[PDB]
Design a protein around this ligand. Structure first.
Ligand SMILES: Nc1ncnc2c1ncn2[C@@H]1O[C@H](CSCC[C@H](N)C(=O)O)[C@@H](O)[C@H]1O
Length: 364
């Protein structure tokens, strides 16, 4: 089996590590390629089927897709792959031509091997790049192709609302992909605990990526501009052994973090404090780690300067931060005796953000 695993742009290596350890725990053999065909936010999983002997003394199969869906914090979707292929030139093709290429390719795929005769299906599409065709066109044409093909075998059953099987068709630049979406219509980063929806909230897979990159060890963790509390809640939910502190300036957001925390089951695990991060040291004396998604906004260059000056008074190990304001954070880091020990660019729902791992320069 081969699977297409999606996550956020620029965290594919962190996902791959996560999925590797989970799979080593089944005892199966597998390989993971990052960014198949050059496409960001994807891994290609090639695995053995996972077989055990059941209560009747027979070989039975365990679902790799369901195991990943229930146990991953970093993935968005787990898709069973039917095919994926480079349609060279397709961006430049006229619309009639592009859809011809897609239909012909789809007609030739053994899709009847991936659905029963009684199961209803629908087609969901996603498209990224510059084409003379839309996601809607793609969904129709693929949906046509699948239907014509299944009906050589029986009576296909369509259900657009509550299908039983979802074929997902994606076209990103000139790369076309078809598979079976096991995760469903709600992507995996959607958290049921999220009752309060902060307008700049962090996606939960990217929050788990920040946590990974901190390389936590049980020391105290502080989010000193914690907003609705995503990073601390995802930490508490990993059953983190260490102390968890959040600070937030505005009482409405802070109360929102408290609600999400209660809704998650983890309120007693996080200390939540109303405060200004520009005055951090009135609130705490020493913390091992700081992890934050900083405000993006001209008063920013000053807010950052002052926060990093106070952080410098309290931080024992590593800070992990994200922001859009490259020049503002890098000046504050430099001016304040910080050292950047990792940088990477991350896609955050259509916004390229920066992530910085820092430590004090004079720590050795
Ligand atoms: N000086 C300051 N001190 C403390 N918090 C501040 C601040 N200036 C801005 N903030 C807060 O920092 C937050 C940044 S974004 C919210 C955090 C996170 N992305 C989430 O998933 O919920 C905003 O809520 C803002 O209120």
């Amino acid at each position: 089996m081969k699977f297409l695993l999606t996550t956020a742009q620029g965290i594919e290596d962190i996902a791959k590590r996560e999925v590797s350890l989970l799979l080593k725990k089944l005892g199966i053999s597998f390989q993971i390629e990052e960014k198949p065909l050059g496409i960001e936010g994807r891994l290609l999983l090639e695995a053995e089927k996972a077989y055990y002997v059941d209560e009747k003394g027979r070989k039975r199969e365990l679902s790799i897709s369901t195991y990943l869906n229930e146990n991953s914090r970093l993935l968005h979707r787990v898709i069973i792959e039917i095919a994926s292929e480079k349609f060279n030139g397709i961006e430049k093709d006229e619309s009639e031509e592009a859809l011809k290429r897609i239909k012909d390719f789809v007609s030739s795929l053994p899709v009847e091997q991936f659905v029963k005769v009684s199961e209803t299906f629908a087609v969901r599409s996603f498209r990224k790049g510059d084409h003379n065709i839309t996601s809607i066109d793609i969904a129709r044409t693929v949906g046509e192709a699948i239907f014509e093909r299944l009906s050589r075998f029986g009576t296909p059953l369509v259900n657009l609302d509550h299908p039983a099987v979802i074929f997902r068709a994606e076209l990103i630049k000139d790369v076309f992909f078809l598979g079976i979406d096991t995760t469903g219509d709600s992507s995996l980063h959607k958290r049921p605990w999220r009752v309060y929806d902060h307008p700049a909230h962090l996606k939960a897979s990217i929050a788990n990526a920040m946590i990974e990159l901190a390389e936590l060890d049980g020391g105290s963790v502080l989010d000193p501009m914690c907003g609705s509390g995503t990073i601390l809640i995802e930490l508490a939910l990993r059953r983190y052994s260490g102390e968890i502190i959040g600070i937030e300036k505005y009482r409405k957001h802070l109360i929102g973090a408290e609600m999400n925390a209660l809704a998650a089951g983890v309120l007693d695990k996080i200390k939540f404090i109303q405060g200004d991060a520009t005055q951090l040291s009135q609130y705490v004396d020493s913390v091992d780690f700081a992890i934050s998604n900083l405000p993006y906004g001209s008063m920013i260059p000053d807010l950052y300067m002052k926060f990093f000056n106070e952080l410098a008074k309290v931080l024992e190990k590593r800070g992990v931060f994200i922001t859009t304001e490259k020049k503002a954070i890098e000046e504050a880091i430099a001016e304040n005796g910080f050292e950047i020990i990792h940088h990477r660019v991350i896609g955050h729902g259509g916004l390229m953000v920066h992530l910085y791992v820092v430590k004090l320069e004079h720590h050795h």
